[PDB]
Design a protein around this ligand. Sequence first.
Ligand SMILES: Cc1ncc(COP(=O)(O)O)c(CN)c1O
Ligand SMILES: Cc1ncc(COP(=O)(O)O)c(CN)c1O
Ligand code: NA
Lengths: 361, 362
Amino acid sequence: NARVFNFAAGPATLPENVLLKAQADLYNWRGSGMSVMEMSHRGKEFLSIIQKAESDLRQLLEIPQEYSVLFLQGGATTQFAALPLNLCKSDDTVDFVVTGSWGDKAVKEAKKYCKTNVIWSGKSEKYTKVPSFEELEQTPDAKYLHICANETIHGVEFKDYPVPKNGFLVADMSSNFCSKPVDVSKFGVIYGGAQKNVGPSGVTIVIIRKDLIGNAQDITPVMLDYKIHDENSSLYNTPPCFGIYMCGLVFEDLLEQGGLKEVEKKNQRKADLLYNAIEESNGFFRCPVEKSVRSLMNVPFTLEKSELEAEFIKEAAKEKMVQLKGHRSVGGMRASIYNAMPLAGVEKLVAFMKDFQAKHA
Amino acid sequence: SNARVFNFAAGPATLPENVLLKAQADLYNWRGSGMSVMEMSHRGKEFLSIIQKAESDLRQLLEIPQEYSVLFLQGGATTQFAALPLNLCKSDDTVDFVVTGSWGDKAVKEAKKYCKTNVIWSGKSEKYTKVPSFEELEQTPDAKYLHICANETIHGVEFKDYPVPKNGFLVADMSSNFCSKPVDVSKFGVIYGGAQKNVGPSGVTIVIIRKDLIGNAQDITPVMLDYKIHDENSSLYNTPPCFGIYMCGLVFEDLLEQGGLKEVEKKNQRKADLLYNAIEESNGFFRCPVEKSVRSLMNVPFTLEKSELEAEFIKEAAKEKMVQLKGHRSVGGMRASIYNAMPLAGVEKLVAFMKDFQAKHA
Ligand SMILES: Cc1ncc(COP(=O)(O)O)c(CN)c1O
Ligand SMILES: Cc1ncc(COP(=O)(O)O)c(CN)c1O
Ligand code: NA
């Protein structure tokens, strides 16, 4: 049967023209006589691919030459260790602003390798807000400030960014990467797994200011050492070649769409349809997140009639809208609406919500 | 070339055509699920069926006993060079190594960050052409484990039988001969390897580990390197390399269809013999430096007496659709990597090419 509307939160839906391009290239990429999956990573074909992927990503996000771009394995969770291993001594302090459970996971891992100060946590109001930056009390000698830019489970997204009092800003942008323009120069490090907006799982992108590379802790595994990866242009060991190729296809296609200003407009448009449906529902559907920080990528919502949640999810799936189930601890629903989710999928969901409400009025 | 070439790359490597064509067919919509494998939730029922079948197929192929875990991880074999001593040793423990090539040497260097190392024997002095007699190896009396690289991909040295560890257990990097032949898994505490030679694309690393060795990692172990975390979450602690795992699953299923590892080994031995016999019968025109009894079935390094002709040999072979034959910078010459999926006809073409080349340049 046909392709479904896939609301999965990661891995996620990918552009159909990209998938079909990959299908067409799979057996024999451009007359090279082999698949990307069979290429030497030190061969001229693969080198062309990873170089074009880097150049395309630099163009898309406007990443200047003062920053390195690394294509790594291990997921964002590997970076939770790599960051303080590379950037801190064991007795340095990192500040965290914790706006959901991904930030909390980052804090717990960093505690192995340095000191951590959680200068603000949204937990007491169920992770529904971003703090006022002026009232944060930042540690005066902090090495860096870590945020999770888009909290995938909780639907809380930074629109503006804090200015570190000392040191530099590090952001986990896994679930909103390449969804909108970002002024990279405000950051020391931007990182994220590919598997929401830019490719399949198995590739993690690290964007790191060059003056911060080097001097990792002695216990840093070679495979977590940024200087090693940078000096070898992400080919220290065998990279995730097919994944990097797929990212390259996605980056190329985002440029063809008109770049990130255009991508942002589409994302804002389709998210507004869903949030407006929720707010106009007279409480039938509810989104807990404070309006100004509502994610364009992950939309958590509940039903006033909580007992109807299983029926909602099951009937949506019969209507080809899958993976709408929300997190264990609040229940309800989560609509993930990443760059490649078609406008028509969001419209189908909004129509289904309207009909469901009228039926269970 | 709009025909597929004979691809002698050392990793990533050639893969079976039937596997690639199955992946092509299903890439847009896997089995009416309505999405690609590349778009599936790792916590969803479709992907769970894929990873579970991949593990089941591998357990059958290798005859992995029930008391071993199978982990599908990211990071390559190089990440395991760190994860092994982090998980298995305290910081003042010792690991013994037999070093038969440069991959083992890299494992030693990384392990030193995490524990003490002892190289009992190195083949470096004879340019990595031999395996030591095992009984005379002086093992450390309290060594936690003994590490080998079962197939040294650059040097072409392959273990046929295995040493018996004295105090601890045996760990083997089988990256470049993984699923080329039967292995008595019970002889090992850990077998590991990147998928990218014999069983899949780059991005997936397999670790087969005895369950009683899991747990008790050093406090500084990253969560992503911790065997207990991966095992208790069945390799889904974080987001796994879903598509790579899928691809490995296809390869395992095809290796079972071929008749399993006894059949795979026969084919490997047969095609390797063709190439080694061509070299030995050439009256010194071609030379392999490796001692005969430990010559790899997977990677065949060889040189020309007239070394000035090596560049032409490689360029001319590539015009004849035999690519990636250049050998390592320290010895020059050539390296023919002839993994499971390398067709017999590719080895036949190279041998015929070698014959013609010698006749022409004799
Ligand atoms: C915002 C965020 N951060 C980190 C992660 C962890 O990424 P990975 O599974 O690649 O380790 C996720 C995964 N959903 C995420 O959404
Ligand atoms: C025997 C062996 N061990 C380890 C490695 C390193 O593996 P990776 O690039 O996946 O880290 C290689 C790669 N050629 C290898 O051949
Ligand atoms: Na201090």
